[PDB]
Amino acid sequence: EEKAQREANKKIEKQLQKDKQVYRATHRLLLLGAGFETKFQVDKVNFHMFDVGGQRDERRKWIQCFNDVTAIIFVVANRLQEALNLFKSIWNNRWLRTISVILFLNKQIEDYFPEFARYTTDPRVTRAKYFIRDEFLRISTASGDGRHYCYPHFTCAVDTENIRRVFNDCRDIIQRMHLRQYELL
Amino acid sequence: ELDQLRQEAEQLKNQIRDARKACADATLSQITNNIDPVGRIQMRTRRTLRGHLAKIYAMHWGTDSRLLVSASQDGKLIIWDSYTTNKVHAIPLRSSWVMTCAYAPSGNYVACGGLDNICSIYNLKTREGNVRVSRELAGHTGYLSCCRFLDDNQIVTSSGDTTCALWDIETGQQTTTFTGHTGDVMSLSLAPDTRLFVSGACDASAKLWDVREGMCRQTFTGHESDINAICFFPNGNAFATGSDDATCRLFDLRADQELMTYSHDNIICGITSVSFSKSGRLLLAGYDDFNCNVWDALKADRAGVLAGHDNRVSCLGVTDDGMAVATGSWDSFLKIWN
Amino acid sequence: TASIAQARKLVEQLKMEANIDRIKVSKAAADLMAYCEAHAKEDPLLTPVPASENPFR
Amino acid sequence: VFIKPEVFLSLGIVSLLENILVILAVVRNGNLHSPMYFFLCSLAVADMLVSVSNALETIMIAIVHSDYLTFEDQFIQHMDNIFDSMICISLVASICNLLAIAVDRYVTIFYALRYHSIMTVRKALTLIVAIWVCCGVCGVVFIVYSESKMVIVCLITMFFAMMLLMGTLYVHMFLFARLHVKRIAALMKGAVTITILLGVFIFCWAPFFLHLVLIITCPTNPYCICYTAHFNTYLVLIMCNSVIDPLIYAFRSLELRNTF
Amino acid sequence: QVQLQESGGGLVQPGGSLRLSCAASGFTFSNYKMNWVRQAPGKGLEWVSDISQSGASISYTGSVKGRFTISRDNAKNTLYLQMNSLKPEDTAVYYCARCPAPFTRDCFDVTSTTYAYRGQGTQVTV
Amino acid sequence: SYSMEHFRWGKPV
Ligand SMILES: [Ca+2]
């Protein structure tokens, strides 16, 4: 019976070594913030995107099972301060402390943000856009230690070019991780 | 309106507290003061099981104390022979985000669930010899945190929608719902007689449920933060809880209050899992600093450390004959200690 | 009505939880200690077995 | 002109210990870690082989110098060939593994999303075994015809080519990293690392191959005999490289450093 | 049991000053970060202010920056909000909220619909 | 007499 058990273990191991090849060659993304799985492929590399819309409003327990994801896609349009606070709590989490964030500013003013009166970049809309981007970047570039970064973008159209952007930032994420592991960055 | 009801609730809480204080004749420490200490407990890794690609979230021993099931978030459910380190089954899941698993007491079925809000029951003893999804139970509005087979036809689940439920696998319908918590339910533990069970939740409270009548009999509030794990004492008249305030606590059902606190000044991480040895004299607890501790449950003094993992310890279990301990971890290896 | 049914349910639950019978802590501690003592010789982790009877040797 | 026998023995044991520890630390963790660590293990084996071969030949040289002759002119030649072939194959294998590590790093950085689908463990093993087979065949063939053939010409150009490759790859890598800095500061470490790697490579391997060039380009110039007189000092630097290699490749990995 | 109880508040004219207080029991006050949250009549819960374990780090929402002041007394286990130069917009229910876990830097879930470690609140009308 | 040395190629033979 030991021969049969050894044979069964052999079959299991052969299948596991084949599944590991598919698992490691795929990039998993989380799409919290706003708008379940979706498998899409761009330039012969497969991406796996998850959206977690079916849960409750308490995030601190099921968010820590996404600690090995390659990047977090955060879509953000006082509704702004709530998004800022959510970003600040995600950034400083103990388990999501090495995850990069791809930020999509989907909108494309001094009463709620009084620091705008002294901020210098119609040029008024560009000033507003860069103010919001600078708020998010001022949160991100304060407690990084060099293990994760933020990649903000402006998105307002029919989103014909929103898939190449995620491709480009997911390439930069891995390039920076490897360059930092080789003591070169 | 609301004011009178809240005043009545405060009065009832004060009465309950005074009744509990009237029963505090003495402490557990003064009674177990003249007990010989356990000593130093040293354990050695017998086996290491390596087949998982991603972090491990749950494990569960079989009733024969030899086979065990484990769940990993690469989408895998692996059944191992612990003696020979073989693999018996490897089951792929439709959803890769699995947070719990269970083993039927008869050994014929296995269950799992997770961020898909569904409990999947797989038939191991298939007529064709192929593990196939026997049933899918879908009535929860939040991720499943725990599941425990009562028998081959009943199962208790706990969900992140702040409820527990008892199912009927033959018809796939909920029979009763246990609704008193105000936070995610994180763990549950069945009684030896399987007539009651306890649950711990993210409101820093634990509740005792009567399965047959579907009510709540007692509530225990000693912890300061979310309760992550819960276990039942061997005789079923006490239980242990571990939470995020970096402490464990022991509660007594008949005295209706907390007896012992297992905490140290240098431990500032949360407890992820608890278990009891065969006689209830040791309390095994896994932590976020990657190693487990052994506590003398009668004296609240650390007696040993299980330091072999390189990432956070997620699961922890003791066999039904009490002869081995299995711990999984976020580095995707299971280890068996003796 | 939005947040008064919850108050009524809480009051009822506290009422039916305040009328139960409790025993002294001394009795419970003695019972737990006695159970632990009566099963001390059947705990392989507390009192390790000889290397012949360990199945994980 | 003459190096004490103690020096070769002194370096042999230290390099033995270091490379054995590296192999153990890789083994005492994930058994099939990645293609990244198979090359480290192979480089450790090559360094160990270099040191063992040189130390054993040193003890054999010391055993027969004046007294207790083994054989007159036939057995000693066979033993000399046996040791020198091992030294040659280990030399070529060491250089090849150093270049393979660099190519692997280049592929991870510059084809980042398609790696893992272009470099698997099967390909890492089938390239390591090919490296060792080709190195062994070349070493035996070189040593057999070491008398007067042009196997010297085939032995130096190889090195130069390999040297060039590393000098390109790493340099490109560094320049790329600089671009990233230029986009991070608008919101040296790499130079020092590159200097350490390349400087160790050239300053430990180039003197021996420059000696090889000099003894065949002009072996009679008075200034070309003042260089080809420290041949033993150039054999020492190769064992120094075998000592230093686990310090700058495996000792810099946090997981390996944590394992031991 | 984790209990937070708020006091202070009432009806004031614009330009007036109030001092909300929050007394906490059932936990170690100094291991946790503390926050002030408010719910206006008609909208959802809104974050107002936060203070760290020692009181070195202080943060305010945009609209209250300059005219609210938070402080904590760890010996007496209490939290404050000094509100001066009040506006008719500032009328709401004010709750005193607590971080989910000790020693951590992030405060998740504090302004949720059903949160477990925040008080019952006090009404402020201006 | 064939004397053994430390490696081959150490003198212009
Ligand atoms: Ca020789």
3-state secondary structure D137-179: HHHHHHHHCCCCCHHHHHHHHHHHHHHHHHHHHHHHHHHHHHH
Find out whether D259 and D22 touch, Cβ atoms under 8 Å: no
The CA F3 to ligand 1 mean position distance, Å, reads: 9
Interface of D with A (CB under 8 A): 105, 108-109, 112-114, 116-117, 120, 173-174, 176-177, 180-181, 184, 187, 189-190, 193-194, 252
The CA D41 to ligand 1 mean position distance, Å, reads: 27
At how many degrees (to 10) do helices D153-184 and D189-217 cross?
170
CA D161 to chain centre: 15
Closest CA to D96 of D53, D51, D57, D137: D137
Neighbouring-strand partners of residue E21? E7, E80
- Compute how many other C-beta atoms are within 10 angstroms of the C-beta atom of residue B338: 19
User: How far, in Å, CA of B80 to CA of B93, rounded?
Assistant: 17
Q: Is A146 annotated as a binding residue?
A: no
User: How far, in Å, CA of E121 to CA of E110, rounded?
Assistant: 14
Contacting subunits of F (3+ beta carbon pairs below 8 A): D
Q: Is A15 annotated as a binding residue?
A: no
Q: Is A21 annotated as a binding residue?
A: no
Find out whether B61 and B80 touch, Cβ atoms under 8 Å: no
Q: Classify strands B196-201 and B45-49 as parallel, antiparallel or unpaired.
A: unpaired
- Compute how many other C-beta atoms are within 10 angstroms of the C-beta atom of residue A123: 7
The residue assigned the tokens 């007294």 is D67
Per-residue b/e over B225-253, b at no fewer than 16 CB within 10 Å? bbbbbbbbbbbbbbbbbbbbbbbbbbbbb
Contacts of E115 in chain A (CB under 8 A): 58
User: Which residues neighbour B276 within 8 Å (Cβ) at sequence distance 6 or greater?
Assistant: B231, B232, B233, B234, B240, B282, B283, B284, B297, B318
Find out whether D23 and D246 touch, Cβ atoms under 8 Å: no
Strand order in the sheet with E10-11: E10-11, E122-125, E92-98, E34-39, E45-51, E58-60
Give resolution, Å, one decimal. 2.9
User: How far, in Å, CA of C24 to CA of B254, rounded?
Assistant: 9
Per-residue b/e over B126-161, b at no fewer than 16 CB within 10 Å? eeeeebeebbebebbebbbbbbbbbeeebbbbbbbb
Report all structural domains of chain D as residue ranges with CATH numbers, in order of start: 5-259 (1.20.1070.10)
Find out whether B100 and B112 touch, Cβ atoms under 8 Å: yes
Any E CB within 8 A of A85 CB: yes
Any E CB within 8 A of B225 CB: yes
The CA D22 to ligand 1 mean position distance, Å, reads: 29
Question: What is the tally of structural domains in chain E?
Answer: 1
The CA D83 to ligand 1 mean position distance, Å, reads: 7
Beta-strand ranges (E) seen in chain E are 3-7, 10-11, 18-25, 34-39, 45-51, 58-60, 68-73, 78-83, 92-98, 122-125
User: Which residues neighbour C27 within 8 Å (Cβ) at sequence distance 6 or greater?
Assistant: B254, B255
Count CA atoms within 13 Å of residue B291 on its CB side: 11
Find out whether A162 and A155 touch, Cβ atoms under 8 Å: yes
Backbone angles phi, psi at B243, to 5 degrees: -135, -170
The number of residues making up chain F comes to: 13
- Amino acid making up residue B184: D
User: How far, in Å, CA of B259 to CA of C33, rounded?
Assistant: 12
Answer whether D235 sits within 8 Å of F6, measured CB to CB.
yes
Report all structural domains of chain B as residue ranges with CATH numbers, in order of start: 1-337 (2.130.10.10)
Domain that holds residue E11: 1-126
User: How far, in Å, CA of B59 to CA of B333, rounded?
Assistant: 11
User: Which residues neighbour B271 within 8 Å (Cβ) at sequence distance 6 or greater?
Assistant: B228, B229, B242, B243, B244, B246, B247, B248, B285, B286, B287
Find out whether A66 and E79 touch, Cβ atoms under 8 Å: no
**From the CA of A40, how many Å to the nearest CA of chain E?**
32
Report all structural domains of chain C as residue ranges with CATH numbers, in order of start: 4-56 (4.10.260.10)
Find out whether E4 and E24 touch, Cβ atoms under 8 Å: yes
Closest CA to B327 of B39, B43, B93: B43
- The SS3 of residue B323 is coil
Let me know if D16 is exposed, middle or buried by CB neighbors in 10 A (0-12, 13-18, 19+). middle
Answer whether A52 sits within 8 Å of B115, measured CB to CB.
yes
- The SS3 of residue C48 is coil
DSSP assignment letter at C50: P
Count CA atoms within 13 Å of residue B230 on its CB side: 31
